[PDB]
Scaffold this active site. Structure first.
Site, short mmCIF file in Angstrom:
data_model
loop_
_atom_site.label_atom_id
_atom_site.label_comp_id
_atom_site.label_asym_id
_atom_site.label_seq_id
_atom_site.Cartn_x
_atom_site.Cartn_y
_atom_site.Cartn_z
N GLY A 10 0.82 -1.31 -0.08
CA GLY A 10 0.09 -0.12 0.05
C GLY A 10 0.82 1.14 -0.04
O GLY A 10 1.90 1.28 -0.70
N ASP A 51 13.52 -11.10 -4.33
CA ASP A 51 12.87 -10.30 -5.28
C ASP A 51 13.64 -9.14 -5.70
O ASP A 51 13.51 -7.75 -5.77
CB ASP A 51 11.42 -9.81 -5.05
CG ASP A 51 10.67 -9.14 -5.96
OD1 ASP A 51 11.30 -9.20 -7.29
OD2 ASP A 51 9.62 -8.53 -5.85
C1 LIG Z 1 7.50 -7.63 -1.18
N1 LIG Z 1 8.39 -6.36 -1.89
C2 LIG Z 1 9.55 -7.09 -2.78
C3 LIG Z 1 8.23 -5.00 -1.96
C4 LIG Z 1 7.23 -4.53 -0.82
C5 LIG Z 1 6.99 -3.37 -1.05
C6 LIG Z 1 7.56 -2.60 -1.89
C7 LIG Z 1 8.54 -2.82 -2.80
C8 LIG Z 1 8.88 -4.37 -2.67
C9 LIG Z 1 9.12 -1.87 -3.49
C10 LIG Z 1 8.21 -0.81 -3.81
N2 LIG Z 1 7.88 0.08 -2.72
C11 LIG Z 1 7.78 1.39 -2.49
C12 LIG Z 1 6.51 2.11 -2.72
C13 LIG Z 1 6.59 3.60 -2.57
C14 LIG Z 1 7.71 4.10 -2.08
C15 LIG Z 1 8.89 3.27 -1.75
C16 LIG Z 1 10.07 4.08 -1.13
C17 LIG Z 1 10.30 5.34 -1.87
C18 LIG Z 1 11.46 6.08 -1.29
N3 LIG Z 1 11.86 7.38 -1.65
C19 LIG Z 1 11.35 7.95 -2.78
C20 LIG Z 1 11.95 9.32 -3.04
C21 LIG Z 1 11.50 10.15 -3.73
C22 LIG Z 1 10.62 9.75 -4.81
C23 LIG Z 1 9.87 10.55 -5.95
O1 LIG Z 1 8.77 10.47 -5.81
N4 LIG Z 1 10.69 10.97 -6.90
C24 LIG Z 1 10.06 11.61 -7.98
C25 LIG Z 1 11.17 12.54 -8.77
O2 LIG Z 1 12.35 11.64 -9.20
C26 LIG Z 1 13.08 11.26 -7.88
C27 LIG Z 1 12.24 10.58 -6.91
C28 LIG Z 1 9.97 8.36 -4.43
N5 LIG Z 1 10.38 7.83 -3.69
C29 LIG Z 1 12.01 5.55 -0.09
O3 LIG Z 1 13.02 6.42 0.55
N6 LIG Z 1 11.74 4.21 0.45
C30 LIG Z 1 12.43 4.08 1.80
C31 LIG Z 1 10.78 3.86 -0.07
C32 LIG Z 1 8.88 2.02 -1.92
C33 LIG Z 1 10.15 1.25 -1.49
O4 LIG Z 1 10.10 0.38 -0.25
C34 LIG Z 1 7.26 -0.87 -1.65
O5 LIG Z 1 6.90 -0.41 -0.40
#
Ligand SMILES: CN(C)c1ccc2c(c1)CCN(c1cccc(-c3cc(Nc4ccc(C(=O)N5CCOCC5)cn4)c(=O)n(C)c3)c1CO)C2=O
EC number: 2.7.10.2
Length: 263
Positions: free
Chosen positions: A19, A126
């Site tokens: 989420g 993953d």
């Molecule tokens: C079961 N598995 C393998 C999973 C479960 C959950 C997730 C994932 C894999 C991977 C994806 N994910 C997820 C979802 C949402 C956020 C994060 C997520 C995003 C971060 N940081 C940022 C910073 C900037 C931006 C941004 O919007 N931009 C736009 C312009 O270009 C520069 C950056 C996005 N994220 C961050 O620091 N963490 C620790 C997690 C994460 C990473 O955690 C999950 O939460």
């Protein structure tokens, strides 16, 4: 256990498997990301027990877990904030105009974190560019390692599900659910390929089904234009049909450092 009285929620970062994820501050000082675990998405009691062991995983190239909030619903997961977001998107931005030495350094950052996890006998399961993050200094860190075990969505966890990481999986995972250190090794080779391809989808002209068949025939990803012969030999070595002939992360890191010195 973090007291949620010490958290602020400032901006939305996006949505993942569990989420919404927010940026905010912890103790009025520290930047953090906060996963707000959507009801029904996670095997919560199992995760809570495992968060204990995860709290002890600490490496400069692993996104640091700061704590959890579990005396409430939804539960929160609080981590190190990575200002440049996911590696996949970052590689796809042409403005960065990366040198190939930068690309190899991103492969080295990830390899260091994986060598650490291999030393702790902890599987990622993953590993892919979409699951690595980039901080404000351009350092790549491995994220969400081990969390696949707690995902309740069958489309993600089943070998045949629509969301399973087929293009990152060795033949024995696709055919027999044989997960090991060597299935992370195979995924890491595909990640190197993503990096040197500037974020192209692996097997970009094939479906998941066709990919599964291509790799069962012994065929593999072509060398990205940016990869030298030596860089391609490293990612290729991760894809040996016999899992026991693939290197360890320790070997890969020595191989990467050798190419850095050479090139
Ligand atoms: C079961 N598995 C393998 C999973 C479960 C959950 C997730 C994932 C894999 C991977 C994806 N994910 C997820 C979802 C949402 C956020 C994060 C997520 C995003 C971060 N940081 C940022 C910073 C900037 C931006 C941004 O919007 N931009 C736009 C312009 O270009 C520069 C950056 C996005 N994220 C961050 O620091 N963490 C620790 C997690 C994460 C990473 O955690 C999950 O939460």
């Amino acid at each position: 256990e973090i007291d949620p009285k010490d958290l602020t929620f400032l901006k939305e970062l996006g949505t993942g498997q569990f989420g919404v994820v927010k940026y905010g501050k912890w103790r009025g000082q520290y930047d953090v990301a906060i996963k707000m675990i959507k009801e029904g998405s996670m095997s919560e009691d199992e995760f809570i027990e495992e968060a204990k062991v995860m709290m002890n995983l600490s490496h400069e190239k692993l996104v640091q877990l700061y704590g959890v909030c579990t005396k409430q619903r939804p539960i929160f997961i609080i981590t190190e904030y990575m200002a440049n977001g996911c590696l996949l998107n970052y590689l796809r931005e042409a403005r960065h105009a990366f040198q190939t030495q930068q690309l190899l350094e991103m492969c080295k950052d990830v390899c260091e974190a994986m060598e650490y996890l291999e030393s702790k006998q902890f599987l990622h399961r993953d590993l892919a560019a979409r699951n690595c993050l980039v901080n404000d200094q351009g350092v790549v860190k491995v994220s969400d390692f081990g969390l696949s075990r707690y995902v309740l969505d069958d489309e993600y966890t089943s070998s045949v599900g629509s969301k399973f990481p087929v293009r990152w999986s060795p033949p024995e995972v696709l055919m027999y659910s044989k997960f090991s250190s060597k299935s992370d090794i195979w995924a890491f080779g595909v990640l190197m390929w993503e990096i040197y391809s500037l974020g192209k989808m692996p097997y970009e002209r094939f479906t998941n089904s066709e990919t599964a068949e291509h790799i069962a025939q012994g065929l593999r990803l072509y060398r990205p234009h940016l990869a030298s012969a030596a860089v391609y030999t490293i990612m290729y070595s991760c894809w040996h049909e016999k899992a026991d002939e693939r290197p360890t992360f320790k070997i890969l890191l020595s191989n990467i450092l050798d190419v850095m010195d050479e090139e």
